[PDB]
Symmetry: D2
Subunit: 130 residues, 4 copies
Amino acid sequence: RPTPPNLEFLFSANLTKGPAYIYDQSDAQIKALQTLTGGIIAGPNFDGTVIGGTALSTRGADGTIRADAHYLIQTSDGANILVTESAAIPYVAVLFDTSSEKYNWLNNVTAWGTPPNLNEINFLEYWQIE
Amino acid sequence: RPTPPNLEFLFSANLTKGPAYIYDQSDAQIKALQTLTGGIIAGPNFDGTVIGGTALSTRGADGTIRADAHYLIQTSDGANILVTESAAIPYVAVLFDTSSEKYNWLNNVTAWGTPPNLNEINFLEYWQIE
Amino acid sequence: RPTPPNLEFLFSANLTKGPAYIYDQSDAQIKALQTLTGGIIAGPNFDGTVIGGTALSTRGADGTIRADAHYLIQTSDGANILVTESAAIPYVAVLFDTSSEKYNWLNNVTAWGTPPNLNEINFLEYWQIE
Amino acid sequence: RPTPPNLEFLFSANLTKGPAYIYDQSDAQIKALQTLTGGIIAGPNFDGTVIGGTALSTRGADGTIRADAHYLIQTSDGANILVTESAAIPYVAVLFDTSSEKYNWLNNVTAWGTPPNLNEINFLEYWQIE
């Protein structure tokens, strides 16, 4: 019997976004760019704010949405962390890059998040998977 | 208390790889390209073989390894599925693309895998996270 | 004797950027995220403004700078065009995505740009290469 | 009057490819993975062979083809160079990564290529643009 990975609560994000700018409209799919204008990061590991970032999404006529994003967290104690998201919406996979010694452990983390309330898509809870 | 996602066993991969070709060697990190020459896919959902694909890795002097890969599964019943991997080795995040009607549900899946035996890095077990 | 491609002036961009947020500082290289906060697009083909976008750069101790960016142009006549940049700074390669019928021809274009004045890195002139 | 960049002949590639594996077939577009199984590299700067690599393409019902590829050149004198291609077919933009001291200058190069004969799509001539 394969052994499943362990899940540990990592952080939450309460994001603010600009309007979705559709650049590729067709009967088959809509592709958009959306700015991440800010956000609150909370949790037992790091808290802080989202400085900025961009999301690219493709919304299929079939209801499938694939999104890729980068955004920059700045922690309360001044560390910069790049967040790399890849999603099969509403499921979001996450990688991290930082040279902060306090937060360096995130360079080895795969995380995963989803909005706990699918009526509030800009509030996500993320889990460390290992 | 945040609610964790559910984990369901998805597939295993027993991959074959060519040699790692280092193209960027420095004291700080090694970057390599590695061909995925084949592999066995097994599990309760799909079985088949790996047709081909490429992995790009960066191995830090700090022991962190980040890898990105694409490879193509062909199922026993003839479906082509693109696998998009992004890893903080040995933890691997996975997305899928197919137009197969039988396997279309994978377009909405985030999966996650790791070698159950870290002495055998080319055998991974993957889980659907949702 | 190989035949070189033809070069036609395509557009200029006068970009505004936020501060460079360094997330990965080491003796070997600096990696940063920078927001594209706006900009003027001009030329004989399209004019308009930059709505938004993000640049990721790595600046080597060796002086090499590699950058990738996405930003969204909105033309004077309301068309949305995604610009995908990949650079060996100060040389910038460009692709485009739009479903605008007026600007659809850009989906088939490879462009290339550089600041005419390397003291003014945020003003670039771009050329259609074919 | 904007000043155009200079074009210098860089290399040619005579590539071999495996079959195109379509993973996403629809009336709107076809997405495929294709293995680069080998190739001859020639020119005044470097000659050698293609070790391997993968191309991902999307072929629109509208005739537009967008492709992204990575492949590894090994020069006659043993240097490994990663080639990163992004194309609006048949126009191909190119970046390079190597730590070879002899070929390090390619890390600062944007190149561009196209098949001189569009009946022979696997033979391309590439130009340094700067």
